[PDB]
Amino acid sequence: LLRCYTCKSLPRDERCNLTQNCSHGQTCTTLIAHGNTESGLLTTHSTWCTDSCQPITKTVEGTQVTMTCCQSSLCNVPPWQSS
């Protein structure tokens, strides 16, 4: 029994206030996306419960994507945000 932040696509300086109870084996993940849009450049963060995540940093069509993993309640927050 672990609780993770579960927030689809939040702006950089928004904190997440939705959480889920993950199931047998699951860990906390966070996907950060930084790149350009029609309306200016944008850092977004997405959070959820996952089975085996691998962290990555990859650049994919000009927008930088980073995935992070962790195994404690409410640990999946963007690297510039606090618990």
Binding site: S9, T37, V60, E61, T63
Partner: protein, 421 residues
């Protein structure tokens, strides 16, 4: 030498895969030793099909060589019935009974003379060969281990009863690749009805990609491309031991083509070829997959669901779309697909497949192509189910909606959720 038998039995080797240099002569135990048959290893018997020339086709050395690559300690016996295979088709077809009886007599002999176990024998029959292998399996003293049917012949077998063709009873496990089923039943080159424990239909079985206009060893490749493909799929399986191709059970090929049948629950999927799981289902199977035109062959399957949203209420028809997948390992850009119609506040599911090993999905771009006004929808999320990794992925727009506008900039979505099954 109550052993008159017309068929010949060559034991080829990893270093001599082309010629029939050493023969196992039934009724002559000393021949087995001459030829260095390995009593401690499994045995493949390769049974060719019909041949308008008197000769082996060029696939025979390839299959032998692949089997020895995958199984370097095994015994690969090539059965020669070239003489009977050179007749007019209905004659050669009739001779499948005698070639089968010859092969069963030979196997039964190896069992009586050497206590060689029949559960160490895998028969691989191509075309007419598949039925010769079926009949042989039905006449062995104990049941043989595996029969593999590579596009079993259709004419005079489609409406034949089990004793006279390949059927599931003929071995402990029977797996069949159907690759050239185009035609009306009984007039297809390859048999239409499932005759195995597991029957796989690459590209729905009727015709194979890469077989229309080509560069084409063999007397006339262009005509028998789709038929012969069954063998090259098996070969490709022998060479990709730790990287097989899934095939997915499905109610129909039409259903498969909509992406309704990915899913690997309760043997709803299996591996094509050598690495197959020997399920022996309660009745039939019938499984589907897509493939490439040239070798490696393996492809990755995804289902895509898109809900097209808007306040305004239009329909469009035979609309064309490009979708681009970006993953941790690679990307494949500009995959085409079309939709019968695209109407507001409706959801459409569909199959995407790609030769490219993407890795885990990260970003997904959608382009609405103008047709060979001013219309567009708002899309918030796209759902994707991946067949090979049994994962459901959700992408959502970086902003609150991605506007999809026909003939303009592609809508961009990034992964916001993952799930396994």
């Amino acid at each position: 030498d109550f052993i008159d038998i017309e068929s010949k039995f060559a034991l080829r080797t990893p270093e001599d895969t082309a010629e029939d240099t050493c023969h196992l002569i039934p009724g002559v135990a000393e021949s087995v030793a001459t030829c260095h048959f390995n009593h401690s290893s499994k045995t493949f018997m390769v049974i060719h099909g019909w041949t308008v020339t008197g000769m082996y086709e060029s696939w025979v050395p390839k299959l032998v060589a692949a089997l020895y690559k995958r199984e370097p300690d095994s015994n690969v016996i090539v059965v020669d019935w070239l003489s009977r295979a050179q007749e007019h088709y209905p004659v050669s077809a009739g001779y499948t009974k005698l070639v089968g009886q010859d092969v069963a007599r030979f196997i039964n002999w190896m069992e009586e003379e050497f206590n060689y176990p029949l559960d160490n024998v895998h028969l691989l029959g191509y075309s007419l060969g598949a039925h010769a292998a079926g009949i042989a399996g039905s006449l062995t003293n104990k049941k043989v281990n595996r029969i593999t049917g590579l596009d079993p012949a259709g004419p005079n077998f489609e409406y034949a009863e089990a004793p006279s063709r390949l059927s599931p009873d003929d071995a402990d496990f029977v797996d069949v690749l159907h690759t050239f089923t185009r035609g009306s039943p009984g007039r297809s080159i390859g048999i239409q009805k499932p005759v195995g424990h597991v029957d796989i239909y690459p590209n729905g079985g009727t015709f194979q990609p890469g077989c229309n206009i080509g560069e084409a060893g063999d007397v006339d490749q262009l005509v028998k491309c789709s038929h012969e493909r069954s063998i090259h799929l098996f070969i490709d399986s022998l060479l990709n031991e730790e990287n097989p191709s899934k095939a997915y059970r499905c109610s129909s090929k039409e259903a498969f083509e909509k992406g309704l049948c990915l899913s690997c629950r309760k043997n709803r999927c299996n591996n094509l070829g050598y690495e197959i799981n020997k399920v022996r289902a309660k009745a039939s199977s019938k499984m589907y997959l897509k493939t490439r035109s040239q070798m490696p062959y393996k492809v990755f399957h995804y289902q895509v669901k898109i809900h097209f949203s808007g306040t305004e209420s239009e329909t469009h028809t035979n609309q064309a779309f490009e979708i681009s997948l970006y993953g941790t390992v690679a990307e494949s850009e500009n995959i085409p697909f079309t939709l019968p119609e695209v109407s507001t506040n409706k959801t459409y599911s569909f199959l995407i497949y790609t030769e490219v090993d993407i890795g885990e999905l990260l970003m997904l771009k959608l382009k609405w192509k103008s047709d060979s006004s001013s219309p567009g929808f708002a899309i918030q999320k796209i759902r994707v189910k991946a067949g090979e990794t049994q994962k459901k992925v959700i992408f959502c727009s970086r902003e609150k909606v991605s506007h999809l506008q026909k003939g303009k900039a592609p809508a961009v979505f990034v992964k916001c959720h993952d799930k396994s099954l």
